Amino acid sequence: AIEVKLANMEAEINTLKSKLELTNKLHAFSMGKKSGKKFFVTNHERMPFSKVKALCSELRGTVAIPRNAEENKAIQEVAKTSAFLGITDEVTEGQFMYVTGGRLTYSNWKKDEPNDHGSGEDCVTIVDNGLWNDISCQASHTAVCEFPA
Amino acid sequence: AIEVKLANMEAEINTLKSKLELTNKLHAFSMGKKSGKKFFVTNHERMPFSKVKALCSELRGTVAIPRNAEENKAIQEVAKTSAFLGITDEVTEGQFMYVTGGRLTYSNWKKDEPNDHGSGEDCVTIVDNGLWNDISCQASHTAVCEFPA
Amino acid sequence: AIEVKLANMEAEINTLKSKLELTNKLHAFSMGKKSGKKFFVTNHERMPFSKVKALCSELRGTVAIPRNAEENKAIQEVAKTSAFLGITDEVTEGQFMYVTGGRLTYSNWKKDEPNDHGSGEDCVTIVDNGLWNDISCQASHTAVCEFPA
Ligand SMILES: OC[C@H]1O[C@H](OC[C@H]2O[C@H](OC[C@H]3O[C@@H](O)[C@@H](O)[C@@H](O[C@H]4O[C@H](CO)[C@@H](O)[C@H](O)[C@@H]4O[C@H]4O[C@H](CO)[C@@H](O)[C@H](O)[C@@H]4O)[C@@H]3O)[C@@H](O)[C@@H](O[C@H]3O[C@H](CO)[C@@H](O)[C@H](O)[C@@H]3O)[C@@H]2O)[C@@H](O)[C@@H](O)[C@@H]1O
Ligand SMILES: OC[C@H]1O[C@H](O)[C@@H](O)[C@@H](O)[C@@H]1O
Ligand SMILES: [Ca+2]
Ligand SMILES: [Ca+2]
Ligand SMILES: [Ca+2]
Ligand SMILES: [Ca+2]
Ligand SMILES: [Ca+2]
Ligand SMILES: [Ca+2]
Ligand SMILES: [Ca+2]
Ligand SMILES: [Ca+2]
Ligand SMILES: [Ca+2]
């Protein structure tokens, strides 16, 4: 009875949809996501900002963006080394924007930073220290994505 | 068509259920689960007891309960920091019971503990050296969950 | 109804297929898988070679096989202790092969290794500095599986 089978399959679907959902809530917890909080992740791979921005999307995530002191200390914890942030000023030199829109609300630059130094530095990378410094986007640092609370 | 399509989706639900199962195995493996033995998991987020309880449930698991030494240690290694256990005497002061039910059948308290200190301590937290100590349920300690072997 | 419910369902299914392949991509990512590079996993369990060969197969993976300095160091940083490698000379003493077939094309033995010490040593473990040492396939060591790039 086609009528039946369908309903049965709509059941096998929901159960799976519910399982995979559970599988993911346990995968985040595993990855250290705090309760109802945006949490970061990294494979420790170094690459240009175009590839990181890329990779974070394929994983349905955004390039890491510290919107306060905590999230910054937290991003430092994850990468060890230097890693790009979801911040650039490619649109308007000197005017840093989150890859997700909006102007920086929380910052943490180093003395004389940013500075577009040399041929021009449009990407921001937090360095093993917690402070940030602007650098060439064609450079290559630790890829780090974030995921919604 | 209609009948065939309904068939093509049959094997789909199967191959799925089949992949998700394998995927869940790979995870457990990756999160420490040892062969045939239950396994503990944590985000390290310190919190009150009641939360750890709701949290482990949302994940369809339970607050970590050492049922002997190997387990007590296993929880000790994964937590790396003060953590609650599925054990409390909030029912009958003086008698600790598992959240899953029953009376304590294994312990590893430290000198003079439990002491139902101050106004009262009805919650258990594995502490340094893997020893135990009752502390207020309100206090905040690492949430840890266990999933079946 | 029926026909519409079917097209709607087929969509639901393709959605799950994607959501899962995502779950999978995000996991390998957090497990340090570098882009286009085979990643190595572990539960840290120590066991005999035969037991590892099997554990890796149940996950459809294989015993980690370092073929260059990179992969070695990767694995070495995954084990954190000694672990078997998908390499042995069980068939012809002094002619180490890959469990996946063929003679070795790269090694990183310790000094004066391999030595087939005692009753014999036909297996291999990555030890310190990721250096190699042929051991007894019956000795228990960290199980580490590898999955496709
Ligand atoms: O400690 C070991 C050894 O390290 C250094 O020499 C080796 C080093 O050489 C080449 O790059 C030098 C590079 O090293 C970095 O460790 C760091 O010192 C860099 O310094 C800049 O960046 C930091 C980050 O905040 C700043 O604090 C510092 O002031 C410098 O920034 C200045 O310039 C920026 C733009 O370039 C600008 O944004 C800043 O505002 C500021 O003006 C230092 O430049 C490489 O061979 C390097 O290898 C790695 O990097 C290569 C590309 O850079 C790449 O091709 C390689 O594959 C590899 O990834 C290597 O480490 C030096 O410190 C030496 O004294 C020391 O003994
Ligand atoms: O006997 C254990 C160990 O002892 C020495 O380190 C060497 O003989 C090794 O080849 C051997 O595996
Ligand atoms: Ca510019
Ligand atoms: Ca700039
Ligand atoms: Ca600069
Ligand atoms: Ca009480
Ligand atoms: Ca008490
Ligand atoms: Ca106490
Ligand atoms: Ca032999
Ligand atoms: Ca040998
Ligand atoms: Ca040896």
Of B19, B82, B88, whose CA–CA distance to B46 is shortest? B82
d(CA C126, CA C108): 9
Both tokens assigned to B53: 């309880």
Q: Is C128 exposed, middle or buried (0-12, 13-18, 19+ CB in 10 A)?
A: exposed
In single-letter form, the type of residue at position B119 comes to S
Pocket of ligand 2 (CB under 6 A): C 115, 117, 121, 133, 135
Ligand 3 centre from A137 Cα, in Å? 10
Please report residues of A whose CB lies closer than 8 A to that of B59: 22, 25-26, 29
* CATH number for position C61: 3.10.100.10
Contacts of C50 (CB under 8 A, 6+ apart): C137
Tell me the ligand closest to B96's alpha carbon: 7
Minimal CA separation from B69 to chain C, in Å: 17
Q: Which two tokens stand for residue A144?
A: 């780090």
Nearest-CB residue to A41 (from C6, C20, C30): C30
Rounded CA-CA distance C74/A146 in Å is 24
The boundaries of the domain holding residue A137 are: 1-149
Structure tokens at C11: 């969509």
By C-alpha distance, the chain B residue nearest C47 is: B35
If one counts the domains in chain C, the total is: 1
Burial A41-73 (b: 16+ CB within 10 A, else e): bbbebbbbbeebbebbeebebbbbbbeeeebbe
In this structure, is the dihedral angle defined by the CA atoms of residues B30, B34, B37 and B39, taken in order, positive or negative? negative
What are the residues whose beta carbons fall under 8 Å from the beta carbon of B128, sequence distance 6 or more? none
Rounded Cα distance between C17 and C2, Å, is: 22
Length of chain A as a residue count? 149
Q: Please, is A75 exposed, middle or buried when counting C-beta atoms within 10 Å of its C-beta (0-12, 13-18, 19+)?
A: buried
What the block records as the tokens of C104 is 């070795």
Q: Which residues of A touch B27 (CB under 8 A)?
A: 23, 26-27, 30
The closest of C113, C112, C53, C42 to C80, measured between CA atoms, is C42
Most A CBs within 10 Å, among C10, C23, C29, to test the A interface = C29
Please tell me the distance from the alpha carbon of residue A9 to that of residue A133, in angstroms, as a whole number.
54
B109 DSSP 8-state letter: B
Q: Which residues does residue B135 pair with via DSSP β-bridges, in sequence order?
A: B123
**CB A84, CB A141: distance < 8 Å:** yes
Q: Which two tokens stand for residue B147?
A: 């999933």
- Which amino acid does the sequence have at A22? L
Ligand nearest to the CA of B117: 8
Residue of C nearest to A61 (CA): C26
Which residue's entry shows tokens 């009752």? B134
Q: Please, which residues have CB within 8 angstroms of residue A134's CB and are 6 or more apart in sequence?
A: A89, A109, A113, A114, A115, A116, A117, A121, A122, A123, A124
Q: What is the DSSP string of C74-142?
A: HHHHHHSS-EEEEEE-SSSTT--EETTSSB-S---B-TT-----TT---EEEE-STT-EEEE-TTS-EE
The runs of H, that is alpha helices, within A31-113 are 49-58, 69-79
Which chains does chain B touch, 3 or more C-beta pairs < 8 A? A, C
Tokens coding C138 = 């019956």
Resolved by: X-ray
B51: chain A residues, CB-CB within 8 Å: 35
Q: Could you count the other beta carbons within 10 Å of the beta carbon of residue C15?
A: 12
Contact present, A139 and A121 (Cβ < 8 Å): no
Integer distance in angstroms from the first to the last C-alpha of chain A? 44
Q: Is the dihedral of CA A91, A96, A97, A99 positive or negative?
A: positive
Do B64 and B86 touch, CB atoms closer than 8 A?
yes
Chains that contact C by 3+ CB pairs under 8 Å? A, B
CB neighbourhood size of B39 (10 A): 22
Query: Measured between CB atoms, does C116 come within 8 Å of chain B?
Result: no
Is residue B44 within 8 A of residue B140, CB to CB? The reply is: no
For B55, the token pair is: 């949290």
Query: 3-class SS at C6?
Result: helix
Closest Cα to atom 36 of ligand 1? A135
As a three-state string, the secondary structure of B36-101 is CCCEEEEEEEEECHHHHHHHHHHCCCEECCCCCHHHHHHHHHHHCCCEEEEEEEEEECCEEEECCC
Q: Which of B42, A55, A34, A60 is nearest to C23 (CA)?
A: A60
Residue C98, strand partner residues: C87
Half-sphere exposure of A61 (CA within 13 A, CB side): 27
- Within 10 angstroms of residue B100's Cβ, the number of other Cβ atoms is 10
Task: Write b or e for each residue in C85-122: b if 16 or more Cβ atoms lie within 10 A of its Cβ, otherwise e.
Answer: bbbbbeeeeeebbbbeeeeeeeebeeeebbeeeeeebb
Residue nearest to atom 42 of ligand 1 (CA): A117
Ligand nearest, relative to CA of residue A132: 1
| Cβ neighbours of residue B103 closer than 8 Å, sequence gap 6 or more | B95, B96, B97
Tell me how crowded residue C5 is: count the other CB atoms within 10 A of its CB: 14
d(CA A140, ligand 1 centre) in Å: 12
Q: Are B32 and B149 within 8 A, CB to CB?
A: no
| Token pair of C77 as six digits | 């940083």
For a ligand 2 pocket test, name from C133, C134, C138 the mutation site with the most ligand atoms within 8 angstroms of its C-beta. Answer: C133
**Could you tell me the CA-to-CA distances from C18 to B76, C24, C148 in Å, in that order?**
37, 10, 19
Long-range contacts of A116-124 (CB under 8 A, 24+ apart): A120/A93, A122/A88, A122/A89, A122/A90, A122/A93, A123/A49, A123/A84, A123/A85, A123/A87, A123/A88, A124/A84, A124/A85, A124/A87, A124/A88, A124/A96
Which amino acid, C30?
Answer: S
Q: How far apart are the C-alpha atoms of C16 and A63, rounded to whole Å?
A: 25
Q: Is C22 on the interface with A (CB under 8 A)?
A: yes
